[PDB]
Amino acid sequence: VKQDMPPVGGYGPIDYKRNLPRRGLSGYSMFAVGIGALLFGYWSMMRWNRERRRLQIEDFEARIALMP
Amino acid sequence: AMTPFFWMFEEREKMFEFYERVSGARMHAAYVRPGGVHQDLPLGLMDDIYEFS
């Protein structure tokens, strides 16, 4: 009897293909996402700055009335 | 480029384990006499090479 090492009935395949998914996101849509978040930040910052301008006008009234 | 060095060297550590199981040496396995290969592979290597592939 002989006890070498052949492949047992043959061997299965091994792929050799370059797996790169090119994901992606359709980058014009990523520009849309970035400009949307940018404009969201601008609108919220705009509202908060103008209300802090209101309260700073109240502080101006404090220094005006308190002075004499 | 620090890390892919170590990824592919772990794969090469599997390959030095294969050289060890073939002959015994880590790297400088002589093993190829003029007159063909000497002291052939132990039973249970080709399936490991299949797994590595």
What descriptors fit this protein?
part of a larger assembly; 2 chains; A: 68 residues; 1 helix; rod-shaped; B: 53 residues; mainly alpha; 2 helices; globular
Fold blueprint:
This is part of a larger assembly, with chains A (68 residues) and B (53 residues).
Chain A: H1 28-66
Chain B: H1 2-22, E1 32-33, E2 36-37, H2 46-52
Antiparallel strand pairs in B: 1-2
Question: How would you portray this structure in words?
Answer:
It is classed as electron transport. The entry lists the keywords complex I, cellular respiration, mitochondria, electron transport. The entry is titled "Ovine respiratory complex I FRC open class 4". Chain A is ndufa13. The structure is cut from a larger assembly and holds chains A (68 residues) and B (53 residues). With 68 residues, chain A is mainly alpha-helical. Chain A contains one helix and no strands. Helices cover 53% and strands 8% of the residues of chain B. Chain B has two helices and two strands, in the order H-E-E-H. The chains are: A mainly alpha (68), B mainly alpha (53). Chains A and B meet through loops of A and helix 2 of B.
Broad structural category of chain B: mainly alpha
Overall 3D shape of chain A: rod-shaped
Termini separation of chain A: 117 Å
Number of strands of chain B: 2
Largest sheet of chain A: none
Give the spatial strand order of the biggest sheet of chain B: 1-2
| Helical residue percent band of chain A | 55-70%
In short:
The structure is cut from a larger assembly and holds chains A (68 residues) and B (53 residues). Helices cover 57% and strands 0% of the residues of chain A. Chain A has one helix spanning 28-66.
